[PDB]
Design a protein around this nucleic acid. Structure first.
Ligand code: CL
Ligand code: CL
Ligand code: CL
Ligand code: CL
Ligand code: CL
Ligand code: MG
Ligand code: MG
Lengths: 142, 144, 145, 143, 144, 144, 144
RNA sequence: AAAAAAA
RNA sequence: UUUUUUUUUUU
RNA sequence: AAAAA
RNA sequence: AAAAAAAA
RNA sequence: AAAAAAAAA
RNA sequence: UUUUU
RNA sequence: UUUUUUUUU
RNA sequence: AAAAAAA
RNA sequence: AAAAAA
RNA sequence: UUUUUUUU
RNA sequence: UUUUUUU
RNA sequence: UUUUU
RNA sequence: UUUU
């Protein structure tokens, strides 16, 4: 129940600024019928302990409708991946079966497409009948 | 394996945490003077140079030390550690000496589970004594 | 036996849908080659209504294969070379195949490793093609997205 | 392997620049109260589905969900009547909602013997519902 | 095992390639200043001194460094490495310090599969930081 | 697998070699006249077109030959090879004929280990005889 | 597998029946008044909308009821069922309430084998009570 | 459990 | 002496 | 482990 | 078999 | 050697 | 088989 | 088992 | 029933 | 799979 | 796991 | 009797 | 141990 | 669950 001696040897290999696999929850404002390019710079912030990083490797993206849909409609949200080497045209869509329930959808970036992205890049486009969308992006900060 | 994006059938919104915890080993040096103990400040662990400037408390698990500069002429390197705690400072002097004058001296101590509480910047980790002018510290701790 | 009438499906909540999905394909098309000159194969040749792929703007190429489409010059055997090109760096390989019969095509291909399987848009080039035949047929196993 | 490799290709293989592709096409239709709407097959051929290069398709199963809220005091329902060129059906596969804020779903599978092609002028099924829109998901084989 | 030349019943003409690929690790040195990070150019990997002057692109897999000269007086040698990528530079600082003043300081990093693309001579591999004036690098790569 | 860079706990400086060896299959053609033996030079292996302009010697292991052009009228293609050695030329005539006028002829020989020494550019590999005016050679050798 | 018509080696003329028995699950709705028990007529099961207009009798096996419309304000939906038999009505009130105001209420009962006799249009199946103005009934029954 | 049939 | 569909308790 | 159909 | 990077 | 055709008599 | 320790 | 279609050594 | 084999 | 300790 | 190999 | 890539 | 499923 |  007390301190014990450690027989430390040579000075090991160190790294003061290591990588960090994180999950960053943040929201975006969306206009109806209009696509919103989610910026990668939203992941670098003191609010996420990640303002010290300049690049990140996104592994997967997911989205949830943060506000209620227009009256008489069910919530929906689409996600279109974006890459510097070539943007995609897939519209991964998820719709709510209950008007009072969020709509969820996401996608996974293949290993061959997991490169670095800086604050000036864009993750994906977002289309929804709701005015805000909550995202939880699984990415590797480095 | 997959060569293109695939769809994830995500369900309800999960539990999230934008500011989680982080177990780390922080390498930083402190300046030690001959025949004198240096109280290692916990505030040296919160810094943008370790990505931990967003933390205000930390749970230290184990401290290790290495002499960073050469010892005085005709002497071998040594380094001592005295664990400090807010509920009561220790009187142990975990000493490690170098058997070669050109080689570092090293020593460390592990903090028991019953003594692993958070520490703020105004707190201190341990006292350091060495015949060298600088000591390299590697502290394994949990930031929260 | 099999069911001979329409049967009810007990569907549940609305699922996750995607109207514009991906497509792993093997696209055949031809290119014209001159003698002693290398022709850069454009990625835009993969996007056409003749392949049902004019809706795609990007594509991840996995492997390329080539065949000589026309007869070689007199007394010669057909050959063809391929030089992989990437936006991060052009290779210098010249994967060559020669026909052992003057009446037979020459063939060769190259596979792209998973680390170099990024996307390429229409303005990009897949590879360079050299041959003594005035036309080469290309079959490119790729993943449209 | 972190580099390009050589493929020892042989003879020229059989090629097809325009294959068939099996899909699940999502789209919506407008429905009136008391009136049955015929779903055209031509909706399956669109640039929004990457299928504007197709002229025929083999339908296998149809699924329907109510896309808007039902009238006041009611629960959502939806009915599907299959239609064929060899002869229309009289079935009305119906699904109702046990919650007013929740959709209603129903579907039907087309057997193997009735899985022939259909062109844009044809119709898939008749849809009835109390909601003013219905979301359809049709598992079909284009060719 | 045989003592004479023997015939080879060859068949059709094979698939050939006069300019193949090559898996190498290139030993070369760079000059480092105090308190300054030096960017390692990729064009150092292409030279007639390594039989690689015929390539223009290269896929780097892992980098390792060693201090090529002695550290300043009273200091132990150290070396840092910060990986750089055309899609996004890293902020890591993989450091290696020597426990003996007369011994080199070594450290290295590995590039994951999803980041192993080609690099041309204008590109840069990583930054180097060391108290020694020269550093020896061995860059395991794949010339193509 | 992994998705980010990882530290390598490198140790002592390894044994390096900037100019290594290379086992290669070199393809190249030679122009042959009817009824005349052409001595294939070893200097044809050392070329920038083969990334081998940095070598001066090579250890040949096996030689294979293919007729590159069509044979004269009414004849079938044939090709011969006579192995040459600086310690003594051989008199073998390894011949391969085609069973089809449109098809190449092919033959090859393997150099035994006891006769696998180095050859410089001024040396010759073998003599080629053919009714076709060009012959394609694929030589398996070890550059050093 | 078979792609053409095949002959059937039939025999004697079999036993036939142009109007066979049919067992069904009939979905129909009834209007209910608050505080008033509605007697469900069997004549609602005989209709062209169920392909059962040709039948004159039916053996009811089990009944299930759902509230078809929304409940009053500040109330949860409920529905009660009292089985009715020509040999003697019951006094049971199988009741089911909704735990959510937006969710239907549901309850049903099964008729024992000894009580599964035929019923004509002038007969009644059960009484329904609900705070909702319509009830959706699904009756499993054998038409004969 | 209920509808072709089969020696 | 051997099956496709309307509901359907129980292992 | 060597040759010559 | 092959110099290079690794590795109880 | 898929169907149609005598039967293990 | 034929020619070789 | 045989006559024609398709599969597989 | 669609991508690269089917030994 | 990361970061750390064994 | 990159280039050459060994009895259809 | 190898298996790996979106409905 | 947190994260992401 | 730790001072030859
Ligand atoms: Cl709402
Ligand atoms: Cl290159
Ligand atoms: Cl050649
Ligand atoms: Cl013989
Ligand atoms: Cl103890
Ligand atoms: Mg030819
Ligand atoms: Mg032949």
């Amino acid at each position: 129940n007390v301190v014990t001696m450690i027989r430390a040897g040579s000075y090991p290999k160190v790294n003061p600024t290591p990588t960090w696999v994180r999950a960053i929850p943040f929201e975006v404002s969306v206009q109806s019928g209009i696509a919103f390019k989610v910026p990668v710079g939203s992941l670098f912030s003191a609010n996420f302990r990640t303002d010290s990083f300049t690049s990140v490797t996104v592994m997967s993206v997911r989205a949830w409708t943060q506000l209620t849909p227009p009256v008489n409609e069910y919530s929906f949200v689409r996600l279109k991946p974006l890459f510097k080497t070539g943007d995609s045209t897939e519209e991964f869509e998820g719709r709510a079966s209950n008007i009072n329930t969020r709509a969820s959808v996401g996608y996974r970036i293949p290993t061959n497409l997991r490169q670095n992205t800086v604050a000036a890049d864009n993750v994906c486009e977002v289309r929804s009948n709701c005015r805000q969308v909550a995202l939880v992006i699984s990415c590797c900060f480095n």
